[PDB]
Protein backbone atom coordinates (compact mmCIF):
# COMPACT_ATOMS: atom_id res chain seq x y z
CA UNK A 1 0.00 0.00 0.00
CA UNK A 2 2.66 2.51 1.06
CA UNK A 3 4.86 1.55 -1.88
CA UNK A 4 1.88 1.57 -4.19
CA UNK A 5 1.37 5.20 -3.19
CA UNK A 6 2.52 8.11 -5.31
CA UNK A 7 6.20 8.83 -4.68
CA UNK A 8 8.29 11.38 -6.63
CA UNK A 9 11.32 9.24 -7.62
CA UNK A 10 12.13 8.41 -4.02
CA UNK A 11 10.94 9.05 -0.50
CA UNK A 12 11.73 11.08 2.58
CA UNK A 13 12.95 8.82 5.41
CA UNK A 14 14.76 9.86 8.58
CA UNK A 15 18.27 10.92 7.59
CA UNK A 16 19.16 12.39 10.99
CA UNK A 17 21.00 9.36 12.39
CA UNK A 18 21.71 8.23 8.83
CA UNK A 19 23.99 11.22 8.22
CA UNK A 20 25.77 10.54 11.51
CA UNK A 21 26.34 6.92 10.52
CA UNK A 22 27.66 8.08 7.14
CA UNK A 23 30.23 10.26 8.90
CA UNK A 24 31.65 7.27 10.78
CA UNK A 25 32.00 5.43 7.48
CA UNK A 26 33.54 8.42 5.69
CA UNK A 27 36.22 8.81 8.35
CA UNK A 28 37.09 5.12 8.01
CA UNK A 29 37.59 5.22 4.26
CA UNK A 30 39.74 8.35 4.38
CA UNK A 31 41.94 6.93 7.15
CA UNK A 32 42.19 3.38 5.73
CA UNK A 33 43.18 4.70 2.30
CA UNK A 34 46.00 6.85 3.66
CA UNK A 35 47.06 4.28 6.27
CA UNK A 36 48.00 1.93 3.44
CA UNK A 37 51.06 4.12 2.86
CA UNK A 38 52.50 2.69 6.09
CA UNK A 39 52.32 -0.91 4.92
CA UNK A 40 50.79 -3.16 7.53
CA UNK A 41 51.59 -6.17 9.70
CA UNK A 42 51.29 -9.15 7.34
CA UNK A 43 47.59 -9.70 6.53
CA UNK A 44 47.27 -13.46 6.92
CA UNK A 45 43.53 -13.22 7.49
CA UNK A 46 42.01 -9.71 7.36
CA UNK A 47 38.38 -8.82 6.69
CA UNK A 48 37.71 -7.60 3.16
CA UNK A 49 33.96 -7.53 2.42
CA UNK A 50 34.59 -5.07 -0.43
CA UNK A 51 33.02 -1.57 -0.08
CA UNK A 52 29.52 -1.99 -1.53
CA UNK A 53 28.57 1.67 -1.13
CA UNK A 54 29.74 3.99 -3.90
CA UNK A 55 28.67 7.20 -2.15
CA UNK A 56 31.39 7.13 0.50
CA UNK A 57 33.77 5.71 -2.09
CA UNK A 58 33.32 8.71 -4.40
CA UNK A 59 33.50 11.17 -1.49
CA UNK A 60 36.71 9.62 -0.19
CA UNK A 61 38.13 9.80 -3.72
CA UNK A 62 37.83 13.58 -4.03
CA UNK A 63 38.90 14.10 -0.42
CA UNK A 64 41.95 11.87 -0.86
CA UNK A 65 43.12 13.53 -4.07
CA UNK A 66 42.54 17.06 -2.75
CA UNK A 67 44.20 16.28 0.57
CA UNK A 68 47.13 14.72 -1.25
CA UNK A 69 47.41 17.76 -3.52
CA UNK A 70 47.38 20.04 -0.46
CA UNK A 71 50.71 18.48 0.51
CA UNK A 72 52.49 19.77 -2.59
CA UNK A 73 52.93 23.18 -0.97
CA UNK A 74 56.02 22.71 1.16
CA UNK A 75 55.35 26.15 2.65
CA UNK A 76 52.15 25.12 4.44
CA UNK A 77 53.62 21.64 4.94
CA UNK A 78 56.49 22.97 7.05
CA UNK A 79 54.01 25.20 8.88
CA UNK A 80 52.13 22.11 10.07
CA UNK A 81 55.43 20.55 11.13
CA UNK A 82 55.90 23.61 13.33
CA UNK A 83 52.78 22.88 15.38
CA UNK A 84 52.81 22.19 19.12
CA UNK A 85 51.63 18.66 19.82
CA UNK A 86 51.30 19.30 23.55
CA UNK A 87 47.53 19.43 23.96
CA UNK A 88 45.77 17.37 21.23
CA UNK A 89 42.23 18.12 22.43
CA UNK A 90 42.94 21.82 23.01
CA UNK A 91 44.49 22.25 19.55
CA UNK A 92 41.51 20.55 17.92
CA UNK A 93 39.01 22.46 20.07
CA UNK A 94 40.67 25.77 19.22
CA UNK A 95 40.55 25.30 15.44
CA UNK A 96 37.01 23.95 15.81
CA UNK A 97 35.77 27.07 17.59
CA UNK A 98 38.07 29.42 15.64
CA UNK A 99 36.26 28.81 12.35
CA UNK A 100 32.95 28.89 14.25
CA UNK A 101 33.18 32.30 15.96
CA UNK A 102 32.22 34.11 12.75
CA UNK A 103 29.52 31.56 11.96
CA UNK A 104 30.58 31.56 8.32
CA UNK A 105 28.84 28.66 6.60
CA UNK A 106 31.29 28.75 3.70
CA UNK A 107 31.62 24.93 3.82
CA UNK A 108 35.39 25.33 3.38
CA UNK A 109 35.76 25.43 7.17
CA UNK A 110 34.79 21.75 7.12
CA UNK A 111 37.06 20.48 4.34
CA UNK A 112 39.95 22.46 5.85
CA UNK A 113 39.31 20.77 9.19
CA UNK A 114 39.44 17.39 7.47
CA UNK A 115 42.93 18.11 6.13
CA UNK A 116 44.07 19.25 9.56
CA UNK A 117 42.56 16.19 11.25
CA UNK A 118 44.09 13.74 8.76
CA UNK A 119 47.50 15.38 9.23
CA UNK A 120 47.23 14.77 12.98
CA UNK A 121 46.04 11.20 12.43
CA UNK A 122 48.94 10.50 10.09
CA UNK A 123 51.36 12.02 12.60
CA UNK A 124 50.01 9.88 15.43
CA UNK A 125 50.08 6.85 13.14
CA UNK A 126 53.79 7.47 12.59
CA UNK A 127 54.17 7.29 16.37
CA UNK A 128 52.62 3.81 16.38
CA UNK A 129 49.73 4.69 18.69
CA UNK A 130 46.36 3.25 17.49
CA UNK A 131 44.71 4.41 20.72
CA UNK A 132 45.10 8.11 19.89
CA UNK A 133 43.92 7.40 16.34
CA UNK A 134 40.57 6.34 17.78
CA UNK A 135 40.49 9.35 20.09
CA UNK A 136 40.96 11.89 17.28
CA UNK A 137 38.15 10.21 15.33
CA UNK A 138 35.91 10.48 18.37
CA UNK A 139 36.69 14.20 18.61
CA UNK A 140 35.95 14.71 14.93
CA UNK A 141 32.54 13.11 15.29
CA UNK A 142 32.05 14.82 18.68
CA UNK A 143 31.97 18.29 17.13
CA UNK A 144 29.85 16.86 14.31
CA UNK A 145 27.11 15.65 16.66
CA UNK A 146 27.53 18.82 18.71
CA UNK A 147 26.48 21.32 16.04
CA UNK A 148 27.53 20.15 12.55
CA UNK A 149 24.67 17.62 12.30
CA UNK A 150 22.16 20.47 12.47
CA UNK A 151 23.67 22.13 9.41
CA UNK A 152 24.07 18.91 7.43
CA UNK A 153 20.45 17.91 8.01
CA UNK A 154 19.19 21.32 6.88
CA UNK A 155 21.00 21.10 3.53
CA UNK A 156 19.42 17.71 2.87
CA UNK A 157 22.33 15.51 3.85
CA UNK A 158 25.67 15.57 2.05
CA UNK A 159 23.92 17.06 -0.98
CA UNK A 160 25.52 20.40 -0.16
CA UNK A 161 28.97 18.84 -0.19
CA UNK A 162 28.26 17.10 -3.50
CA UNK A 163 27.23 20.47 -4.91
CA UNK A 164 30.17 22.32 -3.36
CA UNK A 165 32.56 20.24 -5.44
CA UNK A 166 33.28 22.57 -8.33
CA UNK A 167 36.01 22.87 -10.94
CA UNK A 168 36.29 26.34 -12.61
CA UNK A 169 38.59 28.74 -10.74
CA UNK A 170 39.55 25.92 -8.35
CA UNK A 171 42.87 27.72 -7.85
CA UNK A 172 41.18 30.43 -5.80
CA UNK A 173 39.45 27.71 -3.79
CA UNK A 174 42.85 26.20 -3.05
CA UNK A 175 44.09 29.57 -1.79
CA UNK A 176 40.89 29.91 0.22
CA UNK A 177 41.43 26.61 2.05
CA UNK A 178 45.10 27.43 2.64
CA UNK A 179 44.23 30.88 3.95
CA UNK A 180 41.67 29.57 6.43
CA UNK A 181 44.15 27.04 7.82
CA UNK A 182 46.87 29.69 7.93
CA UNK A 183 44.58 32.09 9.81
CA UNK A 184 43.86 29.70 12.69
CA UNK A 185 47.53 28.70 12.82
CA UNK A 186 48.52 32.38 13.05
CA UNK A 187 46.37 32.74 16.16
CA UNK A 188 47.74 29.49 17.55
CA UNK A 189 51.48 30.03 17.12
CA UNK A 190 51.53 33.37 18.93
CA UNK A 191 55.34 33.43 19.30
CA UNK A 192 55.01 30.16 21.20
Amino acid sequence: MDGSGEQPRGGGPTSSEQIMKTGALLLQGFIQDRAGRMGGEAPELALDPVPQDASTKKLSECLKRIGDELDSNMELQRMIAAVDTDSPREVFFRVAADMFSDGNFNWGRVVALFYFASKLVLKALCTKVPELIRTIMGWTLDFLRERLLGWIQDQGGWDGLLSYFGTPTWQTVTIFVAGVLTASLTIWKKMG
Binding site: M20, K21, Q28, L47
Partner: peptide, 20 residues
Protein backbone atom coordinates in the same frame (compact mmCIF):
# COMPACT_ATOMS: atom_id res chain seq x y z
CA UNK B 1 31.31 16.98 24.67
CA UNK B 2 32.84 14.01 26.50
CA UNK B 3 30.05 11.44 26.68
CA UNK B 4 28.96 12.17 23.12
CA UNK B 5 32.51 11.66 21.82
CA UNK B 6 32.54 8.23 23.48
CA UNK B 7 29.40 7.03 21.70
CA UNK B 8 30.63 8.52 18.43
CA UNK B 9 33.99 6.85 18.98
CA UNK B 10 32.06 3.60 19.22
CA UNK B 11 30.11 4.45 16.05
CA UNK B 12 33.35 5.16 14.24
CA UNK B 13 34.59 1.72 15.23
CA UNK B 14 31.17 0.26 14.49
CA UNK B 15 31.47 1.19 10.82
CA UNK B 16 35.24 0.68 10.73
CA UNK B 17 35.05 -3.03 11.52
CA UNK B 18 32.10 -3.22 9.15
CA UNK B 19 34.35 -2.76 6.12
CA UNK B 20 37.74 -3.75 7.53
Amino acid sequence: EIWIAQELRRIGDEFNAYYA
